Design a protein around this nucleic acid. Structure first.
Ligand SMILES: Nc1ncnc2c1ncn2[C@@H]1O[C@H](COP(=O)(O)OP(=O)(O)OP(O)(O)=S)[C@@H](O)[C@H]1O
Ligand SMILES: Nc1ncnc2c1ncn2[C@@H]1O[C@H](COP(=O)(O)OP(=O)(O)OP(O)(O)=S)[C@@H](O)[C@H]1O
Ligand SMILES: [Mg+2]
Ligand SMILES: [Mg+2]
Lengths: 257, 493, 318, 255
DNA sequence: TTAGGGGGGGGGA
DNA sequence: CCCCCCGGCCCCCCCGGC
DNA sequence: CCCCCCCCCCTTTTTTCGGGGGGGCCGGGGGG
C-alpha cells in the first residue's frame, strides 16, 4: 500500500466521471503516472473512442512511484463506488504488480472506514495515438441543450445530421414515422454567460452520426456545464466535456457518405 | 509480463500465421480472397455485374464446414491481408433482434475510428465477421432473419461462419450470401505440419500411423493436435504398437445424419450373427436416438428400395415388406400414443424397435437405388393447404348447400365442375353470364373458382383444360367479374 | 441422538491422485500433467461412482496448491449455469489477473456438464479459445455425447471404465484396516457383487452393514443390500418351463412388493441385452413386452397381465 | 396549409393522447370548422372512445375545408414527447393529407423546432351517437373513482356498481375475498370540486369488466371530475370534461 | 459392401 | 415533478430413452 | 492439356402437456 495513493477529497467526482462513460465501454485500462491518470478505451462497435484525463490538481493527494497500468471492468467499479457516501474521502491504493486495488472510503465526522478490494483484469489493447488536427468547425454549447436536442431527435430516427454554416447550426433526423429539424443560432448574453451558444466556422460542415452513440455521449452532461463539439470533413467528431483538472473526450466516427 | 511458449496450447503455439499455411480447402480460400478483394469494385457496380467467378452479386459470404478445419482462421487472415478493420461477434455476445438492431446495425454504414487513427485505402472500413451464427437461438427474436436482412442491406463486407448449414434456422440465408464450403482436410496436406510439430515437440511418431489418427478425429486438425499433446505427456512414441488403443480411446462419437442412419440401419451385415454380435441391438436402438424425429420416416420411405440379404428360407421379398409395413403401422400407433395428452415418452425406446429396427431387420440388405428423403412431410403440407381451401369454400357455400366439407368435396364439386368450367368449353365467351350467376347464387369468388378447379384428380385434371381456354375468354371473365357487385356470405366484423 | 457420523465416502475420499484405484493409465497421465503442468482442456466421462469428480479435484489441488481458493471456479448442476452466467461470471473469471507459478493456469471445473443447455455450451466456445493462455476447462460428465461437437474438438477426451473387482476389494480392505471392521471373505464378495463396479455403493453398503449388524458376512450383507432385481428378471425370462417363470414372478418379485411397471421396464432392459438369445427372438420378446407395458400404462397393472406376457414369451420360444 | 390549430401549451394535446393511447391505437382526426372530432373502437368491440374539441379550446383553429388527419397515436406520442410542456404547438395541415406538421415554438429562447409525422389511411365508419335518457347520472372526483377502481380490480375481474337512494356501491367479489365501497352524495363549499352529486330515477345494478375500467380511468389526467351516466338497457357512459369539449367512453354491461 | 450423383484437387500420357 | 433503476407477468422456443 | 482415378459430401423437413430457459415490456419504488 505504498506504490500508488490517490485521494479524492469528495468521492462523488470519481463516481460521476465513471458514470460518464460506463454505458459505452466495459473494460478500461487506466495508466497512472507521476503526472496524473489517463485512460483510453474503444467500444464494441469500434466507432466511438473514449479518452479521459485527470490531472494532479483534481486530487487532494496523489503519489505514484513509477507508472502503473490497471485494467478494470467498469461495471464492478461502478458497483463498488455506490457503496460509499458522496461526501466521504475516497483513496485508491495500489501496489507493485497489483492483482487488485483498494478503495478506502473515509468519513471525517464519524470514525468509520470502508475498505473494498476490486480485482483487476488482464486487457490486451493498444493505446491509439490521437494527434492534434485543425478541425474546421468548433461549437461550444450548454450541455443541457445538447442533451435535450439529441434525446428529442433520437426518438424519430436512428441517425442525426449536424450541419454547420454561416451563423446557423442545424440538427436533422429522418425516420419512417416522420422527420424532425432543430435550428440553433449563435447567441451571447453578458447577464447569463453560461447559456451563450458560440460558433467558429472556417469551412461549412455536414456530418451524420448514430443516435445511439450521441445518446451515450450526452450522458457526460453531468460532469460539465458546457460541451464543445469540434467537427471536420471526413474525420471523427470530438465531443469534449471539460473538468477542473482534466477532461472527457468522445471521438465519434461519422457515417460514410 | 509475457507468456512463455511452453505454457501455450499446441493449437495456439502452432496456429497459422499467413494464408499459405492453411491446410486444405485452397479453392475455398482463394474464392473468399477474390470475393473480398473486389468488394469495392462490385459496390461501384451496385453488386449487379457478376464476374467470371460470379461473386459480384453477393454483399456477404457464408463459410460452412465441419468443426476444426480452419474457417475462422481463414476468415481473419483474409480480412487482415486486404487491410480491413475487423468487428467480430460470436455466441458469447447477445445477438438478439433488439441488440443486433442497436449494435452492428450502425456499424454496417459507419467509419472505423480505429482505422482512422491507425492510418491502406481499406483500413477505415469494417469487415463484420459473425461467427457461430448457427448457435443463435430463435426464429424472430433470435435475429437470424435480421442478420439475413442485414446481409441484403450491408454497405461493408460481412462474413458468416457456421458449422451446420442445412438447418431450418439457416433457411433465411438460402440465397443471400456467397456459399463457401470447407471440407475435411486430407492427410497429405497436414502430414508436413504434423511432422514439424512432432520434431519441434521432441517426440517420435511413425508417419504411417498419421492416417489412422486423422481418421480417428474425422479430419479435425485441432483434435489431432490435442491428441498429440495429451499422448506425448507419457507415451513418447506413437507407432503401430499402440495405434489401436489410441484410436479407440480418442474416437469421436458423432451422431449420424438421417441419410447415414437410414443407410446403416438397412444394411444386412449388422443383422447377421457376426454382425449382430459386433453391432448389438443396443447399438441399433441408440442409432435411432441420434434423430428420433426423422429415423422412422426415413425407414418407412426407404424400406421398399432394397435387395434383401436376410430373407428367411421360403420367404419372398413381398412377404418381408408386408411384415415390415405391419410393424410400421404398430409403431405409428405407438407414436400416436406417445404424443398424446398423457405424454408417454417412456415408450420412446419401444417405438425405436417397432418403427426402425424390426422393420429394417426384415428387409435389410443392399440399397436398390438412392436413399430418398421422406415425402410424407410435403404431402402432409399439401393436404393441409387443400383442406384449408376446402374449408373456406364450404363455409362460403354453407348457406346454399346441405352437407359437410367431405360431402362437398366428394359429391357437390363434380357437379359444380359441369356448371363452372365445362360451359366455357362449349359456349366459349358466351357462358360468362351463366357462370357468374351460378357463382353469385353460392356466394363464390374467383379465387374460390380457381381453388375448386384444382381439387379434381385423375381423369378430371383441369390444368391443361383451363390453359387451353383462349386468353380472351379468361380476360373477359375477369373483367366481367370485377365490373359487378357480388353478394357476401360471411360478414367479418 | 442429534449427532451424525461422517460417511466413509467423505471421510476416506481420496485427496491425492495416488490414492485413486482403477483407470491406471488415465491417472498416470493426470499425475504427469500435474507434474509438468500446461494442463489442457479436458472432458472426463464415465459411469457414476468411479472417481471422476475426485480425480478432477485432486488434479486441481495438486496443480494450484495454496492458490486453489482464487484459481479454481467450480460449478455444478446445483448452481445456476445459464447463458448469462457463462457470459458474465465465467468470462470475468477468465479475464481476471492472477499471478500463478510459472507453469500453472486457472481452472474452471464444470461438474455434470451434460446437464448444461446448448446455449451455454455454444457461448463457452469463444471464451475457451480467447483465454486459453491463462485459463483451462475441465468438464465432468456421464454421457459424453451430450457435449456439443465444437466443445469436444477443443478438449481432450478421458473415458473412465468400470472398476475391476480387484480394485474395489483393495480399497475396501484398506478402509477395513483403517476402521477395524470385522469381516468374512464371503461378506466382501457379496459387497463387491452387489456394488457392480460402483465404489460409492460398495463403501455405503459396507458402512451400513457395519453399523447395523457389525460383522460383515454374506448373511448380514444380504440383509442390508437386497438381491438385484434385474438378475431375478433375467432368471425369470431364461427359465425353461412356464411354471418356473411364473413361480419366479410370484415368489421373488410380486410378493416382495415390486411394482408391475418396474418389472416390465426391467424385463425390457434385460431382453435388450440378452446376447445369448438370437436377435430376432429378442425382437419378438420386446414386442410382447412393449404390448404389456402399453397395457400397464393404461391402468391395468395386474399380475394376470405379467403372467400373460410370460406365457407369450414362452410360446415364442416353442 | 388550410389547417392551422394553435395550442398555448402543447401539454394539453399530449394529455389528450394520454387519455386514449392505450385502449385504441389508430384513429382519424376529422378536423372541421367547428373543431376536431374522433371516434375509435377497441379490438374486442366492447368499448368506444369519442373525443370532441372545439375552437374555443384551440387557440387559433382556422381550418377551412373538411380534412381527415389519420395518424397513429404511437408516433404522435413520440413527437409530442419533444419540446417543453410550456411551448406552443402550431399544428399545420396542408391541402392533401400526406404528413402533418407539429411545430413547437418557445418565446423565452425565440427558437422554433419543426417536426413532421406521416399519415396513414384508416377505414373508419364514424357512427353518430344518439342521446338517451339514462336511468341514473352520478358525478365524482376522478381521483376517487380511479382509487376505487384500482382497489376493487385486485380482488376480482368484475366490478358491480349499484346506484340506489342516496347511495352508490362498488362491489368486487373473488376467491380471496370480497370488497365493498359505499359513497353517499355530499357537497362541500370550501372545496367545491371535492363533491359527489347524484341524479336518481330508477334503481341501477350493473356489472362491468375491471380491465375496461382500468383503461377508462386513464382519462383522469384530462379532467378532475368524472361523470357517469348509467341505464338498465343501454351502454354506460363515462365522461371527462375539457375546456371546450369532452372525452366519453361507452361500455357494455356484462352478466 | 460401398445408395447415386456432383464437386475438389493431386497426378500425369 | 420527473428520470433511473431493477424486480415481476407475459411471451415464445426448445426437449422428452437411457 | 483433357483425361483418369479416388475421395469426400450433399439430397430435407409436421404435432396433443409439463417443465425449464431466455428475452422483452411493464410498473412499483427510490431518488434528485
Ligand atoms: N486448415 C488448418 N491448417 C492448420 N491448422 C489448422 C487448420 N484448421 C484448424 N487448425 C488448427 O486448429 C485451431 C483452431 O482452428 P479454427 O479455424 O479456429 O477452427 P474452426 O475451423 O473455426 O472450427 P470451429 O467451428 O471453430 S470448432 C487453429 O489455431 C490451428 O492450430
Ligand atoms: N476410483 C476411486 N478410488 C477410490 N475411491 C473412489 C473411487 N471412485 C469413487 N470413490 C469413492 O466414491 C466417492 C464418490 O465418488 P465420486 O467420484 O465423487 O462420484 P462420481 O464418480 O463423480 O459419480 P458421478 O458421475 O459424479 S454421479 C468418493 O468420495 C470416494 O470415497
Ligand atoms: Mg471457429
Ligand atoms: Mg462431485
Amino acid at each position: 500500500a505504498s506504490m500508488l495513493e490517490a485521494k479524492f477529497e469528495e468521492a462523488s467526482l470519481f463516481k460521476r466521471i465513471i458514470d460518464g462513460f460506463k454505458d459505452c465501454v466495459q473494460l478500461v485500462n487506466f495508466q497512472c503516472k507521476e503526472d496524473g491518470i489517463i485512460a483510453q478505451a474503444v467500444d464494441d462497435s469500434r466507432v466511438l473512442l473514449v479518452s479521459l484525463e485527470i490531472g494532479v490538481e483534481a486530487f487532494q493527494e496523489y503519489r505514484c512511484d513509477h507508472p502503473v497500468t490497471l485494467g478494470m471492468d467498469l461495471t464492478s467499479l461502478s458497483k463498488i463506488l455506490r457503496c460509499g457516501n458522496n461526501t466521504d474521502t475516497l483513496t485508491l491504493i495500489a501496489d507493485n504488480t497489483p492483482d487488485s486495488i483498494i478503495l478506502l472510503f473515509e468519513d471525517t465526522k464519524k470514525d468509520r472506514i470502508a475498505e473494498y478490494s476490486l480485482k483487476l483484469m488482464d486487457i490486451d489493447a493498444d493505446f491509439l495515438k490521437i494527434e492534434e488536427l485543425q478541425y474546421d468547425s468548433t461549437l461550444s454549447l450548454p450541455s443541457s441543450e445538447f442533451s435535450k436536442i439529441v434525446r428529442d431527435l433520437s426518438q424519430l430516427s436512428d441517425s442525426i445530421n449536424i450541419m454547420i454554416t454561416k451563423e446557423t447550426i442545424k440538427f436533422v433526423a429522418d425516420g419512417d414515422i416522420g422527420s424532425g429539424s432543430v435550428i440553433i443560432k449563435p447567441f451571447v448574453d453578458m447577464e447569463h454567460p453560461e447559456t451563450s451558444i458560440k460558433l467558429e466556422m472556417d469551412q461549412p460542415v455536414d456530418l451524420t452520426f448514430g443516435a445511439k452513440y450521441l445518446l451515450d455521449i450526452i450522458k457526460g452532461s453531468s460532469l460539465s456545464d458546457r460541451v464543445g463539439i469540434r467537427l471536420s470533413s471526413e474525420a471523427p467528431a470530438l465531443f469534449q466535456f471539460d473538468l477542473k483538472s482534466g477532461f472527457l473526450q468522445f471521438f465519434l466516427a461519422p457515417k460514410f457518405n | 509480463n509475457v507468456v512463455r511458449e511452453e505454457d501455450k496450447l499446441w493449437t495456439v503455439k502452432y496456429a497459422p500465421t499467413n494464408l499459405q499455411q492453411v491446410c486444405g480447402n485452397k479453392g475455398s480460400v482463394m474464392k473468399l480472397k477474390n470475393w473480398l478483394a473486389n468488394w469495392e469494385n462490385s459496390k461501384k457496380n451496385s453488386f449487379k455485374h457478376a464476374g467470371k467467378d460470379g461473386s459480384g452479386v453477393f454483399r456477404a459470404a457464408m463459410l460452412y464446414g465441419p468443426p476444426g478445419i480452419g474457417k475462422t482462421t481463414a476468415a481473419h487472415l483474409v480480412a487482415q491481408e486486404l487491410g480491413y478493420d475487423i468487428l467480430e461477434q460470436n455466441a458469447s455476445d447477445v445477438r438478439s433482434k433488439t441488440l443486433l438492431n442497436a449494435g452492428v446495425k450502425n456499424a454496417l454504414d459507419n467509419m472505423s475510428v480505429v482505422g482512422y487513427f491507425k492510418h491502406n485505402l481499406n483500413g477505415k472500413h469494417f469487415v463484420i465477421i459473425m461467427d457461430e451464427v448457427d448457435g443463435m437461438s430463435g426464429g424472430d427474436r433470435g435475429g437470424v432473419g435480421q442478420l439475413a436482412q442485414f446481409c441484403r442491406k450491408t454497405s461493408t463486407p460481412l462474413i458468416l461462419i457456421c458449422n451446420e448449414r442445412n438447418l431450418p434456422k439457416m433457411r433465411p440465408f438460402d440465397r443471400v450470401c456467397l456459399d463457401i464450403q470447407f471440407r475435411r482436410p486430407d492427410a497429405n496436406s497436414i502430414k508436413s505440419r504434423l511432422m514439424t510439430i512432432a520434431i519441434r515437440e521432441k517426440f517420435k511418431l511413425d508417419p504411417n500411423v498419421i492416417d489412422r489418427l486423422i481418421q480417428t478425429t474425422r479430419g479435425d486438425i485441432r483434435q489431432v493436435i490435442n491428441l498429440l499433446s495429451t499422448i506425448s505427456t507419457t507415451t513418447k512414441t506413437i507407432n503401430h504398437e499402440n495405434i489401436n488403443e489410441i484410436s479407440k480411446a480418442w474416437e469421436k462419437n458423432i451422431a449420424l445424419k438421417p441419410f447415414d442412419i437410414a443407410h446403416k440401419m438397412l444394411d444386412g451385415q449388422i443383422y447377421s450373427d457376426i454382425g449382430s454380435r459386433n453391432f448389438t441391438l443396443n447399438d441399433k436402438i441408440a442409432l435411432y436416438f441420434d434423430d428420433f424425429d426423422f429415423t422412422p420416416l426415413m425407414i418407412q420411405e426407404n424400406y421398399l428400395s432394397t435387395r434383401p440379404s436376410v430373407l428367411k428360407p421360403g420367404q419372398s421379398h413381398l412377404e418381408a415388406v408386408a411384415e415390415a409395413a405391419n410393424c410400421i403401422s404398430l409403431g405409428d400407433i405407438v407414436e400416436k400414443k406417445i404424443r398424446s395428452s398423457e405424454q408417454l415418452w417412456s415408450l420412446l425406446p419401444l417405438h425405436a424397435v417397432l418403427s426402425s429396427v424390426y422393420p429394417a431387420s426384415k428387409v435389410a440388405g443392399h440399397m436398390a437405388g438412392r436413399i430418398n428423403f421422406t415425402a410424407w412431410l410435403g404431402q402432409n403440407s399439401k393436404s393441409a393447404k387443400y383442406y384449408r381451401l376446402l374449408q373456406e369454400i364450404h363455409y362460403h357455400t354453407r348457406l346454399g348447400t346441405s352437407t359437410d366439407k367431405i360431402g362437398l368435396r366428394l359429391d357437390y364439386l363434380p357437379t359444380f365442375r359441369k356448371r363452372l368450367l365445362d360451359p366455357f368449353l362449349k359456349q366459349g365467351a358466351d357462358a360468362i353470364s351463366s357462370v357468374i350467376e351460378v357463382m353469385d347464387d353460392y356466394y363464390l369468388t374467383k379465387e374460390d373458382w380457381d381453388s375448386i378447379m384444382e381439387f379434381f384428380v385423375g381423369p378430371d385434371v383441369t390444368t391443361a383444360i383451363i390453359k387451353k381456354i383462349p386468353a380472351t375468354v379468361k380476360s373477359g371473365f375477369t373483367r366481367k367479374y370485377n365490373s359487378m357487385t357480388h353478394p357476401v356470405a360471411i360478414y367479418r366484423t | 441422538t442429534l449427532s451424525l457420523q461422517l460417511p466413509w465416502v467423505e471421510k476416506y475420499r481420496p485427496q491425492v491422485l495416488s490414492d485413486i484405484v482403477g483407470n491406471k493409465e488415465t491417472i498416470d497421465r493426470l499425475q504427469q500433467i500435474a507434474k509438468d503442468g500446461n494442463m489442457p482442456h479436458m472432458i472426463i466421462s464415465g459411469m457414476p461412482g468411479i472417481g471422476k469428480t475426485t480425480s478432477v479435484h485432486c488434479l486441481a489441488h495438486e496443480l494450484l496448491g495454496r492458490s486453489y481458493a482464487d484459481g479454481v471456479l467450480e460449478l455444478n448442476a446445483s448452481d445456476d449455469r445459464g447463458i448469462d452466467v457463462v457470459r458474465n461470471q465465467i468470462k470475468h473469471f477468465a479475464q481476471k489477473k492472477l499471478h500463478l507459478p510459472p507453469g500453472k493456469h486457472k481452472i474452471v471445473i464444470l461438474d455434470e456438464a451434460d446437464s448444461m443447455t446448448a446455449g451455454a455450451q455454444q457461448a463457452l466456445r469463444r471464451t475457451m479459445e480467447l483465454y486459453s493462455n491463462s485459463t483451462r476447462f475441465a468438464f465432468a460428465c456421464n454421457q459424453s455425447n451430450k457435449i456439443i461437437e465444437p466443445l469436444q474438438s477443443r478438449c481432450a477426451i478421458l473415458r473412465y471404465s468400470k472398476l475391476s473387482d480387484e480394485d474395489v476389494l483393495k480399497r475396501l480392505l484398506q478402509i477395513i484396516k483403517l476402521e477395524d471392521v470385522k469381516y468374512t471373505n464371503d461378506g466382501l464378495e457379496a459387497i463387491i457383487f452387489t456394488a457392480e463396479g460402483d465404489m460409492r455403493q460398495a463403501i455405503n453398503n459396507l458402512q451400513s452393514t457395519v453399523a447395523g449388524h457389525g460383522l460383515v458376512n454374506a448373511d448380514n450383507v444380504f440383509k442390508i443390500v437386497d438381491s438385484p432385481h434385474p438378475l431375478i428378471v433375467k432368471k425369470m425370462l431364461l427359465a425353461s418351463n412356464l411354471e418356473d417363470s411364473i413361480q419366479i414372478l410370484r415368489t421373488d418379485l410380486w410378493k416382495k412388493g415390486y411394482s408391475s411397471i418396474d418389472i416390465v421396464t426391467t424385463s425390457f432392459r434385460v431382453t435388450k441385452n440378452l446376447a445369448q438369445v438370437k436377435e430376432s427372438v429378442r425382437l419378438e420378446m420386446i414386442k410382447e413386452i412393449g404390448l404389456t407395458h402399453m397395457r400397464i400404462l393404461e391402468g391395468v397393472g395386474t399380475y394376470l397381465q405379467l403372467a400373460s406376457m410370460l406365457a407369450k414369451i414362452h410360446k415364442l420360444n416353442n
